[PDB]
Amino acid sequence: PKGSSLGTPVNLAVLKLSEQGLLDKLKNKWWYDKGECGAKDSGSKEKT
Amino acid sequence: PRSLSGRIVGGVWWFFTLIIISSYTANLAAFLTVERMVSPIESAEDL
């Protein structure tokens, strides 16, 4: 909400998370890791 | 002899079987190449 107390804090928090690679980590967790289609794993599968 | 009708039939049929036997040969080479690709678990990194 405009002019909120959580404003600045959350903003910095997002920047902190990204620099710690925590954001990238989360995405990898739900997109590729938790994924059902190992793309780089299906190409690494030399048995088909 | 040169019965153009059935002549091109023998030619096209030959080109047909040529492709097939070539495909069989190529594919069979792949089944042995991949059969070797499958490397046994030698280390933990392999798992």
UniProtKB/Swiss-Prot annotation, chain A:
Site positions per UniProt: Interaction with the cone snail toxin Con-ikot-ikot: 16
Induction entry: Down-regulated in the pyramidal cell layer of CA1 in the hippocampus by global ischemia.
Tissue: Detected in forebrain. Detected in dendrites of neuronal cells. Expressed in the pyramidal cell layers of CA1 and CA3 and in the granule cell layer of the dentate gyrus.
Localization terms from the record: Cell membrane; Postsynaptic cell membrane; Postsynaptic density membrane
Domain of life according to the entry: Eukaryota
PTM section of the record: Palmitoylated. Depalmitoylated upon L-glutamate stimulation.
Miscellaneous comment text of the record: The postsynaptic actions of L-glutamate are mediated by a variety of receptors that are named according to their selective agonists. This receptor binds AMPA (quisqualate) > L-glutamate > kainate.
Assembly with partners or alone: Homotetramer or heterotetramer of pore-forming glutamate receptor subunits. Tetramers may be formed by the dimerization of dimers. May interact with MPP4. Forms a ternary complex with GRIP1 and CSPG4. Interacts with ATAD1 in an ATP-dependent manner. ATAD1-catalyzed ATP hydrolysis disrupts binding to ATAD1 and to GRIP1 and leads to AMPAR complex disassembly. Interacts with GRIP2. Interacts with GRIP1. Interacts with NSF via its C-terminus. Interacts with CACNG2, PICK1 and GRIP2. Interacts with GRIA1 and SYNDIG1. Part of a complex containing GRIA2, NSF and NAPA and/or NAPB.
Function per UniProt: Ionotropic glutamate receptor that functions as a ligand-gated cation channel, gated by L-glutamate and glutamatergic agonists such as alpha-amino-3-hydroxy-5-methyl-4-isoxazolepropionic acid (AMPA), quisqualic acid, and kainic acid. L-glutamate acts as an excitatory neurotransmitter at many synapses in the central nervous system and plays an important role in fast excitatory synaptic transmission.
Domain description: The M4 transmembrane segment mediates tetramerization and is required for cell surface expression.
Family: Belongs to the glutamate-gated ion channel (TC 1.A.10.1) family. GRIA2 subfamily.
Protein name: Glutamate receptor 2
Biological source species: Rattus norvegicus (Rat)
Upper classification of the organism: Eukaryota, Metazoa, Chordata, Craniata, Vertebrata
Encoding gene per record: Gria2
